[PDB]
Write an enzyme that holds these catalytic residues in place. Structure first.
Site, short mmCIF file in Angstrom:
data_model
loop_
_atom_site.label_atom_id
_atom_site.label_comp_id
_atom_site.label_asym_id
_atom_site.label_seq_id
_atom_site.Cartn_x
_atom_site.Cartn_y
_atom_site.Cartn_z
N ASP A 205 51.22 42.66 54.02
CA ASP A 205 52.82 41.52 54.51
C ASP A 205 52.78 43.81 53.93
OD1 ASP A 205 55.84 42.61 54.05
OD2 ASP A 205 55.85 41.52 51.68
N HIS B 12 53.41 47.78 64.06
CA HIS B 12 52.40 46.21 63.60
C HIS B 12 51.31 46.00 64.56
CE1 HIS B 12 56.63 44.35 63.62
NE2 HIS B 12 55.81 43.96 62.13
N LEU C 209 32.17 33.03 60.54
CA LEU C 209 33.51 33.53 60.00
C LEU C 209 34.39 32.20 59.79
CD1 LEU C 209 35.01 34.54 57.67
CD2 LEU C 209 35.94 35.70 59.29
O1 LIG Z 1 47.28 40.49 64.53
C1 LIG Z 1 46.05 41.09 66.48
N1 LIG Z 1 47.27 41.26 67.08
C2 LIG Z 1 48.00 42.15 67.77
C3 LIG Z 1 48.73 42.92 68.25
C4 LIG Z 1 49.78 42.62 68.38
C5 LIG Z 1 51.13 42.56 67.85
C6 LIG Z 1 52.04 43.19 67.70
N2 LIG Z 1 53.76 42.33 67.47
C7 LIG Z 1 54.20 42.76 67.26
C8 LIG Z 1 54.20 44.31 68.09
N3 LIG Z 1 52.47 44.15 68.77
C9 LIG Z 1 50.64 41.88 66.60
C10 LIG Z 1 48.81 41.54 66.46
C11 LIG Z 1 44.53 40.78 65.61
C12 LIG Z 1 44.09 42.07 66.02
C13 LIG Z 1 42.99 41.35 66.13
C14 LIG Z 1 42.72 40.27 65.78
C15 LIG Z 1 41.17 40.75 65.27
O2 LIG Z 1 40.53 40.10 64.18
N4 LIG Z 1 40.17 40.40 66.48
C16 LIG Z 1 38.32 41.21 66.31
C17 LIG Z 1 37.91 41.54 67.35
C18 LIG Z 1 36.90 41.48 67.41
C19 LIG Z 1 36.04 41.32 65.83
C20 LIG Z 1 34.74 42.68 65.58
N5 LIG Z 1 33.88 42.50 67.07
C21 LIG Z 1 32.91 43.27 67.08
C22 LIG Z 1 32.72 43.52 65.56
N6 LIG Z 1 33.84 42.76 65.10
C23 LIG Z 1 36.84 41.45 64.92
C24 LIG Z 1 38.46 41.11 64.91
C25 LIG Z 1 43.42 39.27 65.88
N7 LIG Z 1 42.93 38.70 64.64
O3 LIG Z 1 43.00 37.60 64.43
O4 LIG Z 1 42.07 37.74 64.55
C26 LIG Z 1 44.63 39.48 65.52
#
Ligand SMILES: O=C(Nc1ccc(C2=NCCN2)cc1)c1ccc(C(=O)Nc2ccc(-c3ncc[nH]3)cc2)c([N+](=O)[O-])c1
Ligand SMILES: O=C(Nc1ccc(C2=NCCN2)cc1)c1ccc(C(=O)Nc2ccc(-c3ncc[nH]3)cc2)c([N+](=O)[O-])c1
Lengths: 211, 217
Positions: free
Chosen positions: B14, B31, B114
């Site tokens: 949050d 976001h 993970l």
């Molecule tokens: O919540 C995410 N994106 C997002 C983008 C836009 C929005 C949005 N909502 C309204 C406006 N935009 C919401 C969510 C998001 C971003 C990255 C990630 C994510 O963890 N990506 C990731 C990608 C690569 C790595 C990584 N790779 C190698 C080293 N570490 C680690 C993590 C996640 N996720 O759950 O994994 C969600």
């Protein structure tokens, strides 16, 4: 307005040790602190107070309550025991039933004393009930929703829990209420239960009022 | 067990709305910064020995768009050896989306790094109720007796039961409440509340929560 407060009353044994006294002494100071909190809640228009005796044995704690019943009744307190008392000795079970029925009509503070209670247990007892209903053909699996399970868990007739206070410095729920604390404010204090006093309780109520 | 002791951390993320307001920006910038913070936390957890991370996207200030957004991270997660699962009631989601969830789960189910659980349309009460419905179905087919239902059995039917129990719940953003995120699963978890807003929550904050868990037990 905070309507229903629940407290995890931890710290009596740690308090005894800090005072250089045996664990028993800590129980008796914890009991004084029970009375003070119950009075304070009754005095400040809180509707329901739910107390979890916990220490970071349950029979006895309920026994000790037996002699307070006449006083609670005189103060228009409705007393309930929540938790699995079905293996307590039958004499104690009869006294619990007698105290609850004596006070069941009272319209002041409802005081719930959790005895051998666990939040997972509470949910499971409500699930066992729904399961009996399905087996008897009185209920479709699929009619089961949050509202219906809510009707089978402890305290469903009272205001929702607004505030949970835990004394004693640990930051966990410890399998006290689970279902019922979905939207409650969680207030943790390092004060030990025998020391928790009216100003400490007001502090917790401010936390609620700020949020 | 790693030195911090934590096998499964859950985070109520949050503060994204508040953070954007503080900057004079609309909620979308919050976001996007919150997404940067997810990538950073996911990377940190994966590098620190954590078995499972469970994330609950919540703003004190729809769900389906969040999950579309995540669809664009799935290749990258896979490439980082993350096993991805969505927990929550996705049964009324867009039919295309449900198929994209299934395939992203199947694609990464073989991964050994993970485990990342993303809550989408999740609620703690909902999770207990769906577990209860699976049990009631087994009673209605004559497979299960009501009296055989115990904690252990209901435990086997709620989300994440096959993973390590949740050891630590972190909530950023300053509110002290669960807001109907995990409820059965947090009976014994350490709860760590911090006023840091989600987009600002960085590796040193996450190290600090882990070390507070290690120090408290
Ligand atoms: O919540 C995410 N994106 C997002 C983008 C836009 C929005 C949005 N909502 C309204 C406006 N935009 C919401 C969510 C998001 C971003 C990255 C990630 C994510 O963890 N990506 C990731 C990608 C690569 C790595 C990584 N790779 C190698 C080293 N570490 C680690 C993590 C996640 N996720 O759950 O994994 C969600
Ligand atoms: O826990 C209690 N007693 C007790 C005593 C000894 C021990 C003990 N454990 C082993 C060693 N001693 C444990 C518990 C206790 C004490 C007083 C009370 C109690 O509330 N007394 C009481 C009487 C009147 C009022 C009151 N005043 C205004 C409205 N209500 C408030 C409280 C309760 N209680 O729940 O009601 C439990």
């Amino acid at each position: 307005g905070c309507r229903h407060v629940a407290i995890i009353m931890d710290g009596n044994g740690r308090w005894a040790k800090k005072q250089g006294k045996i664990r028993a002494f800590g129980h008796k100071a914890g009991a004084k602190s029970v009375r003070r909190a119950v009075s304070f809640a009754a005095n400040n228009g809180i509707e329901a107070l739910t107390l979890y005796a916990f220490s970071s044995l349950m029979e006895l704690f309920v026994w000790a309550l037996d002699s307070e019943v006449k006083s609670l009744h005189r103060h228009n307190v409705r007393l309930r025991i929540i938790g699995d008392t079905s293996r307590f000795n039958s004499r104690l079970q009869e006294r619990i039933r007698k105290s609850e029925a004596l006070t069941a009509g009272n319209t002041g503070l409802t005081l719930n004393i959790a005895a051998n209670y666990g939040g997972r247990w509470d949910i499971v007892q409500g699930v066992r009930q729904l399961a009996e209903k399905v087996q008897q053909g009185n209920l479709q699996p699929d009619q089961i929703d949050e509202e219906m399970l809510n009707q089978h868990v402890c305290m469903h007739e009272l205001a929702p829990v607004d505030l949970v206070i835990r004394t004693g410095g640990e930051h966990r729920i410890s399998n006290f209420l689970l279902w019922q604390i979905a939207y409650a404010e969680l207030y943790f204090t390092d004060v030990l239960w025998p020391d928790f006093d009216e100003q400490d309780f007001e502090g917790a109520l401010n936390a609620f009022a700020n949020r």
